[PDB]
Amino acid sequence: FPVVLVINCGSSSIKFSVLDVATCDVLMAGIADGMNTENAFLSINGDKPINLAHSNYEDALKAIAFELEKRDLTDSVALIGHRIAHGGELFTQSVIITDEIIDNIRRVSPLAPLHNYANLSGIDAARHLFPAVRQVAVFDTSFHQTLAPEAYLYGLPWEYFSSLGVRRYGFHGTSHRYVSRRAYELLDLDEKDSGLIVAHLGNGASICAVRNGQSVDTSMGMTPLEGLMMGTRSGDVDFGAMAWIAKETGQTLSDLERVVNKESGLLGISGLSSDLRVLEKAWHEGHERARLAIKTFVHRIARHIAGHAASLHRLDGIIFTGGIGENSVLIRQLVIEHLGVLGLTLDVEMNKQPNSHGERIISANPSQVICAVIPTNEEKMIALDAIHLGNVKA
Amino acid sequence: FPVVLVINCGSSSIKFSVLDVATCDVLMAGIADGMNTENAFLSINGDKPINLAHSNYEDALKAIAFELEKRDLTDSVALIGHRIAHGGELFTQSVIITDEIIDNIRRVSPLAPLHNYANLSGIDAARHLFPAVRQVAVFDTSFHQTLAPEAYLYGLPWEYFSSLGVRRYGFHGTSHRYVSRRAYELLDLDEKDSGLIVAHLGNGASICAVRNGQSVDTSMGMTPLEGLMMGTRSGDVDFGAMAWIAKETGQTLSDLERVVNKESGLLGISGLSSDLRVLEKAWHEGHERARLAIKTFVHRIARHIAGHAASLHRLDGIIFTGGIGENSVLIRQLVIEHLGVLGLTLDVEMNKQPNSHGERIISANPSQVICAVIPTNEEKMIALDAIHLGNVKA
Numbered sequence: 001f002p003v004v005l006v007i008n009c010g011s012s013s014i015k016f017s018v019l020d021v022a023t024c025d026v027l028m029a030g031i032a033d034g035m036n037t038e039n040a041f042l043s044i045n046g047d048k049p050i051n052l053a054h055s056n057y058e059d060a061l062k063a064i065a066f067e068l069e070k071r072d073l074t075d076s077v078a079l080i081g082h083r084i085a086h087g088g089e090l091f092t093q094s095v096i097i098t099d100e101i102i103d104n105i106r107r108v109s110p111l112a113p114l115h116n117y118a119n120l121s122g123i124d125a126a127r128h129l130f131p132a133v134r135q136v137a138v139f140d141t142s143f144h145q146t147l148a149p150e151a152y153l154y155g156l157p158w159e160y161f162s163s164l165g166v167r168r169y170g171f172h173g174t175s176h177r178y179v180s181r182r183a184y185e186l187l188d189l190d191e192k193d194s195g196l197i198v199a200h201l202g203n204g205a206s207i208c209a210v211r212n213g214q215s216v217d218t219s220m221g222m223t224p225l226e227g228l229m230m231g232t233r234s235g236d237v238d239f240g241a242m243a244w245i246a247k248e249t250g251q252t253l254s255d256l257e258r259v260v261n262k263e264s265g266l267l268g269i270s271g272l273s274s275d276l277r278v279l280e281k282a283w284h285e286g287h288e289r290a291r292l293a294i295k296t297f298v299h300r301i302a303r304h305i306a307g308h309a310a311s312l313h314r315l316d317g318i319i320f321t322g323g324i325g326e327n328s329v330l331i332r333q334l335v336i337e338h339l340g341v342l343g344l345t346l347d348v349e350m351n352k353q354p355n356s357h358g359e360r361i362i363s364a365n366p367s368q369v370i371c372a373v374i375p376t377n378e379e380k381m382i383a384l385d386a387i388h389l390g391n392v393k394a
Numbered sequence: 395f396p397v398v399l400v401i402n403c404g405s406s407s408i409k410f411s412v413l414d415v416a417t418c419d420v421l422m423a424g425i426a427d428g429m430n431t432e433n434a435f436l437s438i439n440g441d442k443p444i445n446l447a448h449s450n451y452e453d454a455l456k457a458i459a460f461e462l463e464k465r466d467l468t469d470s471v472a473l474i475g476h477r478i479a480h481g482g483e484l485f486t487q488s489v490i491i492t493d494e495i496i497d498n499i500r501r502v503s504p505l506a507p508l509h510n511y512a513n514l515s516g517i518d519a520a521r522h523l524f525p526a527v528r529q530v531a532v533f534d535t536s537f538h539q540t541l542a543p544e545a546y547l548y549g550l551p552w553e554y555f556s557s558l559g560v561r562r563y564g565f566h567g568t569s570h571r572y573v574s575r576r577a578y579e580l581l582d583l584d585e586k587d588s589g590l591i592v593a594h595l596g597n598g599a600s601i602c603a604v605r606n607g608q609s610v611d612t613s614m615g616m617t618p619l620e621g622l623m624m625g626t627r628s629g630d631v632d633f634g635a636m637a638w639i640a641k642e643t644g645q646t647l648s649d650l651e652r653v654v655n656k657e658s659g660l661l662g663i664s665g666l667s668s669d670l671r672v673l674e675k676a677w678h679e680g681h682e683r684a685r686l687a688i689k690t691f692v693h694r695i696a697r698h699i700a701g702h703a704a705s706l707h708r709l710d711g712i713i714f715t716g717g718i719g720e721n722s723v724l725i726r727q728l729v730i731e732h733l734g735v736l737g738l739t740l741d742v743e744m745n746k747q748p749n750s751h752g753e754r755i756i757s758a759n760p761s762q763v764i765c766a767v768i769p770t771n772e773e774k775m776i777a778l779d780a781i782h783l784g785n786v787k788a
C-alpha cells in the first residue's frame with residue numbers, strides 16, 4: 001500500500017502531506033513553522049507540536065522523516081512531490097527530479113529568489129533522506145506556459161523581455177489546472193471545445209482563463225503582485241501613482257515593495273485584517289472601511305473575470321475556488337451579481353451550501369453561463385503527477 | 395456672429411481652435427509648438443509658421459491674439475474655453491472661471507504638476523488679453539467623478555487615499571463624455587437605460603464604461619499611465635516586476651518613470667515607432683516585433699473593454715474613437731474578433747469605410763452588441779459647455 005509525500009517549502013515554513021496512492025486521501029498532514037528563527041516548531045494534524053528550535057531546512061525535514069518511521073510509513077513512501085514557486089520558460093509540465101532539473105530550477109531562481117531557494121533547500125533535504133525514492137517537481141507557473149506573446153508581454157521596451165526575461169508568468173497554476181480538469185466532469189463539458197474562468201480566491205488570489213484545456217490568460221504577472229486585490233497585496237496599481245507617492249513620502253521602491261506586498265489589499269483598506277470572515281462580520285456590525293475593502297475586492301474580481309473572458313471563443317463556466325471561493329457565500333453572490341452583463345442567474349439556495357457539499361453548481365437554469373464551486377486540491381494534483389511519472393523509465 | 399476660442403496648453407505647446415457659435419464649426423486652428431525652448435514657433439492651419447522664439451506662455455497666446463485681430467475676429471470672441479488636465483475631487487462639471495476656480499485648480503495641481511501649471515499659465519494669459527470675455531474651465535477628469543469607491547480605490551493602505559488623495563481619476567473625460575452623448579442618437583438608445591463602452595484610442599488611450607449616462611469605470615488611473623498599452627506608455631504593469639528591474643539594472647523609480655512613460659508601449663515592443671500607420675505597414679512587410687506590438691495592443695484593449703463591461707447592467711454598444719479608433723480598419727476588427735465571447739459580428743464593408751463617413755455603425759445584424767465609430771470632438775464639447783455657461787449670471 002504505497003504512499004506519496006508532498007512537500008511545500010514556503011518562505012517561513014515547510015507544509016507537508018502524506019497521500020495514499022489507492023484513494024489519493026490525506027493520511028497525514030502538518031507544518032514546520034518558524035523556519036530560520038529561534039522558535040522553529042513542528043505541528044502535525046493539529047495535535048501536540050514538537051520543537052527543535054532554529055533548525056535548518058534539512059533538519060526540519062529530517063524531523064518529519066523520523067515521525068514517518070515512528071508511524072511505520074517510511075518503507076511505504078514510493079514517490080515524493082515538491083511544489084516549485086517559479087519554473088520560468090524552462091518548465092511546461094511536471095518532471096522527474098534529476099541533476100539537470102536542479103540546475104534549471106537554480107537558473108530560474110532569480111525570478112523568485114525568496115521562494116525558489118527554499119524549494120531547492122527542500123529538494124536537497126528530501127534527496128538526502130530518501131535516496132531510492134523517485135522525486136517529482138511541480139511548478140506553480142507551468143500551466144500558464146500555453147499563453148501567447150500578446151497575453152504575456154508587457155508594454156515595456158523589448159530589451160527587458162528578451163535580455164532579462166520580464167514577462168507575465170502567473171501563479172496558482174496547479175490549482176487552476178486541477179480545478180479545470182474537475183470542471184469538465186461537473187459541467188459535462190468537452191475539454192477540446194471549452195471556455196472556463198477559474199477564480200482562485202484566498203490570501204493569494206488570481207484569475208485564469210482556460211480555453212480548450214489550455215491557459216490563455218491569468219491575472220498574476222511576473223510576480224504574485226499583479227491582478228486582483230488580495231489579503232495583503234494591493235493588486236493592479238498605477239505605476240505613475242507609485243512614482244508620485246515616492247516623490248512625496250521620500251520612500252524608495254524597496255520600501256514601497258513591502259507596503260504593496262504586506263501592508264496593502266484587504267488589510268490596507270480596512271485597517272483591520274486580511275481575513276474575510278473578520279471583515280464580513282465587521283461589515284455586518286456596520287464597519288465602513290471593511291465594507292469598502294470587500295466591495296473593492298469584489299469589484300476587481302468581476303473586472304478581471306470579465307476581462308479574462310475575452311480570451312475565450314465561448315464562455316461556458318465560472319469556477320470559484322480557494323479558501324474564499326469555497327467558503328464565502330457573500331463574495332460569490334456579490335461577484336456574480338456584478339457580472340449580470342454576461343447573464344448569470346444565481347441560485348442562492350445552492351450558493352448557501354457550505355464547502356462540505358464539495359463540488360457543486362451554484363447557478364440557476366436561466367443563467368447563460370454555469371457557475372460552480374470546486375474545492376481545489378493542490379496536494380492531490382501533485383500526487384497524481386507523481387503517480388503518472390512513477391511509471392516512467394529514467 | 396459670435397465665436398468661441400478653445401485653448402489647450404500642453405507640456406510643450408499651445409493648441410488652439412476658433413469655433414463658430416451658430417454651427418460649432420472650426421474657422422481657425424493652430425499650435426504654438428516648442429514652448430520654453432529657443433525655437434518657439436506659431437503654425438496656423440498648416441500654412442506659413444511665424445516664430446517669436448523662446449517666448450513665454452503669456453506672449454505665445456499674445457502672438458495668437460494679434461493674429462485674431464488681424465483677421466477681424468477679436469471683437470467676435472464671446473467665450474473662451476480652457477482644457478484642464480486634472481480636476482481632482484473638486485470638479486465634477488465644467489465651470490465659469492473665477493478667482494475661486496483658479497485657487498482650486500492650483501490646489502489639485504500637485505496631482506498633475508507638468509500639465510496643470512501649463513493650463514494655469516494659459517488661463518492667466520487669456521484673462522489678461524481678454525478681460526471682458528467669459529472664460530470656462532473644462533476638466534479631463536470631471537466626467538469620471540460619478541465612479542464609486544469600489545471602482546476608484548486602490549489596494550494600497552487607506553492612509554494614502556484619505557491623507558494624500560491617491561485614487562483612480564481617469565482621463566479623456568471630455569472625449570468619453572462627448573462620444574457618449576453622440577452614441578445615444580446614433581444607436582437610438584435611452585440615456586437613462588443604457589450601457590456603453592467607449593474606446594478612446596490614440597497616442598494616449600483609455601477605456602470608459604458609461605452606465606445610464608454616467609461614467610462607472612475607466613482604464614486610466616491617478617495618472618495616464620494605467621490601463622491600456624499606448625504609443626509610448628506601457629499601460630498595466632506588474633509593480634513587482636518594476637521593483638525587480640530596479641534591483642537588477644540599478645535604475646531608480648524616477649528613471650523607470652521615463653522608461654514607462656516615454657520609451658515603452660508600441661514604441662517599446664516594436665523598437666520602430668509609436669505611430670500605428672508605420673507599424674501596420676511594417677507588419678505587412680513581415681516585421682515580427684511590429685506584429686507583436688499591435689497584437690498585444692489589441693489584446694489589452696479587448697481585456698479592458700470586456701473588463702469595463704462588468705460595470706454595466708447591460709451592454710448595448712461599443713464605440714471606437716480617437717486617431718486610432720476612427721481610422722484603423724485593422725485594429726477595430728482584431729479587437730472585435732477578440733470579443734466573440736460577447737457575441738459581436740462585424741460588418742467588414744462598414745468597417746472598411748474611412749473616417750470621412752463620420753459617425754457610423756460597423757457591426758452586423760446578428761451581433762448582440764452594436765459596434766460603431768464616432769469621431770471625437772473635444773473642442774466642440776468645450777464650446778458647447780461655454781455656450782451653455784454663457785447664459786449664466788455670475
Ligand SMILES: Nc1ccn([C@@H]2O[C@H](COP(=O)(O)OP(=O)(O)OP(=O)(O)O)[C@@H](O)[C@H]2O)c(=O)n1
Nearest residue numbers: 201202203204274275276277322323324327328
Ligand atoms: N471557512 C472559511 C475559511 C477561509 N476563509 C477565507 O479564506 C482566506 C484564506 O484562504 P486560503 O486559500 O486558505 O489561503 P492560503 O491557505 O494562504 O492559500 P492561498 O492564499 O494561496 O489561496 C481567508 O481570508 C479567510 O477569511 C473563509 O472565508 N471562510
Ligand SMILES: Nc1ccn([C@@H]2O[C@H](COP(=O)(O)OP(=O)(O)OP(=O)(O)O)[C@@H](O)[C@H]2O)c(=O)n1
Nearest residue numbers: 595596597598668669670671716717718721722
Ligand atoms: N489616418 C490615421 C491617423 C491617425 N492614426 C493613428 O492614430 C494615432 C494618433 O492618434 P491621435 O488621436 O491623433 O493622438 P493625439 O492627437 O496625440 O491625441 P490622443 O493621444 O490623446 O488620442 C497614431 O498612432 C496614428 O498612427 C491612424 O491610424 N490613421
